[PDB]
Write a protein that binds this ligand. Sequence first.
Ligand SMILES: [Mn+2]
Ligand SMILES: [Mn+2]
Lengths: 225, 59, 293, 274, 82, 59
Amino acid sequence: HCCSAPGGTECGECWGAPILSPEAAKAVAVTLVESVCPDAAGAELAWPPEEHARATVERDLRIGRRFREQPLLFELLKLVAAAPPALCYCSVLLRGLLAALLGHWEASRHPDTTHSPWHLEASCTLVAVMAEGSLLPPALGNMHEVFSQLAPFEVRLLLLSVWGFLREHGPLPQKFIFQSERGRFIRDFSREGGGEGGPHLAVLHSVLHRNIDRLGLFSGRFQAP
Amino acid sequence: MSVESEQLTGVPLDDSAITPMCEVTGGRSYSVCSPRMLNQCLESLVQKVQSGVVINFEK
Amino acid sequence: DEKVFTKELDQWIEQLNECKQLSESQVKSLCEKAKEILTKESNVQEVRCPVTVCGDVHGQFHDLMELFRIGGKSPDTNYLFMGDYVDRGYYSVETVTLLVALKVRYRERITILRGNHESRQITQVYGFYDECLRKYGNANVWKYFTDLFDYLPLTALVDGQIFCLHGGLSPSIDTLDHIRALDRLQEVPHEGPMCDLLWSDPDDRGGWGISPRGAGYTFGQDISETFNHANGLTLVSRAHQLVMEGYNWCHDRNVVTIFSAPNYCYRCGNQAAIMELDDTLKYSFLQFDPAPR
Amino acid sequence: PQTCWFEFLLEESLLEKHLRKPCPDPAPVQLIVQFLEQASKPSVNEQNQVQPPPDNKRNRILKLLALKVAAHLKWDLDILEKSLSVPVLNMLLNELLCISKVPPGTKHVDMDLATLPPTTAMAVLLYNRWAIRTIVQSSFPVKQAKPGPPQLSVMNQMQQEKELTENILKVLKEQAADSILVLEAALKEMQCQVCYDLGAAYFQQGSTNSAVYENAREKFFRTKELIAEIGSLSLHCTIDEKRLAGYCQACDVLVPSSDSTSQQLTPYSQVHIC
Amino acid sequence: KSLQEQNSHDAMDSYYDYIWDVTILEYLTYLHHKRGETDKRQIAIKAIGQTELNASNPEEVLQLAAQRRKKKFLQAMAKLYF
Amino acid sequence: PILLFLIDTSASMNQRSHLGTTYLDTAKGAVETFMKLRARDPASRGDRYMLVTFEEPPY
Ligand SMILES: [Mn+2]
Ligand SMILES: [Mn+2]
């Protein structure tokens, strides 16, 4: 209620929901950042390379612990994902969560992934939230469906590919084109040069094709990007 | 961590109120930014360890 | 199946109690089983009191037998040996075989930490490899035990107060969460948080400093105090430096250096100590000198 | 008892005795590895100059002993690939092709399979199948073992063999299509294996282009028909039915063949089509 | 001249988090050690030791950190009054 | 020759680099490395080493 501008236009006949305020989402993102991690060392919205996480592990681990303690942050993240541009500001939290998940998945000797319950759900929620936030093509948005039926290293390499793709396509306030028809800002894919996953979607396809044993039914989703 | 890769082959001089005194008394003050070039500075000092007289030459 | 295997293991235990090493096939079957029994323990393998902490061994079988004589037989008194039990000893193979056999026979009546000396590189050039080649001829058992040495935990926590680890703290590590997140399925790297944990030590300095060992660091009184405050720990127990009283306090009752390998290298002649915590966390101490041979 | 390659180099029936032993120590794959390593050891001249190993009588004996072991193993591509490295497979297959009297350097597609003797035909077919399987496995993502601290001695060989494997992989990729053409003609148990390999290759290729999926579907359907015809008597055909069932489901997602009852009626695929 | 006197009324310790200049914290540490107040000397040492500020960063992070601490301090200060 | 080491002792050095170690401890380690390197020189025996701190005398 607070964030959604009343608008009063009555979008559609009775179905079109009012759009949420990007400014309100911005405020929520900034205050959530300060609440969770007042750190600003990695505030450069451009995502540094993977090795950079090695120095930032400790902060990443404290962020992960805070998340595990407080599930409400996921729902706040979904609320922020509702607005397109707020995620660009909420970039450090996601980087920390990804670093934590990557680190944890490596030290998983279990042949099955479901053995670590909470981490699997956290990874799925992260990927789905990114997809809804539109920093990923829908091909990579489908990614989160298959985490359950995968070996740990598979998910780890997969999230590394996600990291690489996002590194190529740095989330920024630009490229969120405003639409007069609908206030919701749009990020138009395929106009960034890289467009689709390309090399990274090749890795995804290779993974699913190596694991056709139990992923054949799911394979029909990705189709041809 | 300094993501920048230090390709410098020497030890750049530093900018501090000590630096003029270092020059006056005949020394090259060193600024450091990574352990490797710190070791370079260290070996520079070891080589600089000698016995001599500091003289002001003038044309 | 499991029952007959348990009785078979009993024969191996009693035989090892007689200094008679097992067959190569038995060693293979033991290491294979131990992989599955150690895979399930995280880095900070919590252990409930009571307990009997034991310091450095360095594979001196007579000393270990006397230590059993003192503390009690393994099935009765729970033990937490801390590392370095494979080197600088003429019975290192027997010692390590006995330790792993006890661990596999009893999952929770004992727990063994990983010392600096349990790696591929160190053992090759510090006897254990030579001992294995001389005894079993080949190196199959060597490549079994060196493989097993990676699956060991890194630190132990006793009733959320005592923190037992071989070497000591490290400038990179700050909290038990970091230790839990560290990955152990890796031969100890020559530099890194895992590296230092196995080469750290106390000192009356303060701050930090390069260790003369060439690996790890050296922490000061204030570092230990700050780390203890950070995580509510009340006492850290390490065993890497040889001592005389056997147990020595440092950092104003913050780190206890234990050493349970008396007469190090047969010539130091040092006594050896063993610490034991009762159910109500009532620490004590015992001392000994090696049994007649 | 341990018997290295010198015993078999000096005496031939020792190999026969070893393979007759119920528990050949070392295992035959290890024997292949050792023999081919000895063959591939480079020759160092007196001037410390490295050169390719000359193909002497000893080298030929090593190669033919390895090939005899492979023949005894019956050329089980699964076992060879799993137990041997890519350069090892490449050189062994090249040597097998050479001993098959096939002129080296001649493109395989240029020769009519029927005209060639049956042994040469199966040799060429095995070479093409191995190339396809090597390409597919290279495309497969493989978990990386935990790197230990640097070991300058072993990493030299590791990086060298990795570079050779990469070169072989790119060489195979350059000729992948030609292998597909050869296998298509060769298709006219071994037929089922070839058809399954072609279907897998088509699926991998069509990962980019959806058109190849129809060919993959036809291949997989013919493969399942061949499985049904052969029955349990498959002594050389070893293919999992679950993976091909998944392949068929994925392809049916593309091609609707009517017969809704026979085809999937799951709410999942129904929502896909909807 | 202000930190010198002993008559503080502003929760002298809790505010050390907001101060973000290394030199004033150096002064604070010297003062506390001289006057023999270790329980706050340690707080000052920790505040200095925090990695966020080092007086050698490319200043992209330093300005952001100073801005964030200013925001926090002024927000608390506004909460206090009125 | 005479070697003197004037080590800053103000709180400023208590900052930590990406190594997680204080400037003061880095300085101590650097001094130790310097003395190690100098020991390689046969003239090392003639060297006398000194420490001085910023604190007010006599300390
Ligand atoms: Mn030791
Ligand atoms: Mn040790």
